[PDB]
Amino acid sequence: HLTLEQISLFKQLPGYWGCKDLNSVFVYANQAYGELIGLKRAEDCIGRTDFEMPSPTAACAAEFQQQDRYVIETGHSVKVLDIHPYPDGHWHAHIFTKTPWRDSQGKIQGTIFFGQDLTDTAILEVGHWVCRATGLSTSTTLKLTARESEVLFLLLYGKKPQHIARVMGISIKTVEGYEAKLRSKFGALSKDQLIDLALDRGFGSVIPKTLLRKQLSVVLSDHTIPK
Template sequence: MPQAISSNLASIIDQIPGACGCKDEQSIFLYANQEFKAIAGLRPDEPIAGLTDFDLPGDMAVHAQTFREQDQYVLERKTAMTTFNVYRMKCARINAFLVTKKPFMDQETRTSGVLFHLTDMSALNTGLLGPYRSNAPRIFNDLNQPGGVSYVIAGGDTDLDITRREYEVLFYMLRGATAKRIGDFLSISSRTVEQYVTFLKEKFNVLTKQDLIEKAIQLGYYYVMPESVFRTMARPAATHFPRHEPVSSFHSLRNGARDTQPASR
């Protein structure tokens, strides 16, 4: 049984707006507020301490392995991570959450792990959720997965020193968009897009565009969404806690990248 957190930290979690909780260093739940328990499919009187994501009765459990990999990334890098998670529920309802994770240390109990916060974005009717609801053959065709999808929201800093604009070009290119279509999305010329592709090939140390696509997928970049792309489409309300910080690298998430291939990843 995991060590309990202090009553002070539990009280803070209970007072934070939205669904919130924490896990230990093995991704075992230590505590969560009632809002998160409801989202996870637990009754108010059911304990969550000692459970893992695999044990949750709700539809979120479909991403359990991905969540655990994200937890380990946050702990190993000592950095925050923000993801956008979409779930196609059994009742045909679409649920979407902006999730922020960050390392924490309970000063009273000396317990450490991952603190998480969910902002419900299920009311979105356009942008990201539009093609998910309609199964329209748009750029986000990966949203057609039966269980849903989890994107890592990223800034411009990575181990490969990828710029914000290069990130945007890579994101659309991995989804099968042509240089002209990417240029239309980003309001730049197709020639400029090709220049960014050349820069990306150099940074990924590959010779061809196909090699770039394959290596980017292998390294886990398919489900990394540039922050600028996400905010343009979703424009979520600001979450004041925990504070969002850009993710610096995604190589530890490569297993999730291999699980699903793109329709046109």
């Protein structure tokens, strides 16, 4: 059995986290998540779905549940970029980790969600260094528009044009125009080479500022470093 001292760690572990059952009905949410989602007491989440929270995040509950069902049906964990207006009147950005929740015999019985704030330390501007065979190099242009920057960021995290068009609220053909502009600016011969050239220049380290005021919930491809 846990001591009260250890239970205080359960109460104080940072982040925004909880678990849901197989129908994405909340089973627990910590106090930080409850306050973020507009509730006075986080216990008031229990028995509700994402559609039923007093929060604009509920506009994206279908996407949350599609992510949950993917975790449940494959057993894979995902990382989700979540950008929403919240009942406190501010836009927030988080990465939510979603993993299977298992019972005592190892069977999947729901999902665990674990969110961390994206701070200004993650919204830097792109530098001017380039990966080399050894070390790095810099000069002494790749100036991108807002839409171009948003398309590039999503491409670098594994998103297809159909995903990007749905995230940005534009047509697939419009995304292809931005892809072509990006390929020209980077001098890339292919979409795959565009990704390589952009990654070697630090474009993966920067969330475009205009993305921080677009409501979205999108799984980001995630791989260990190094690999």
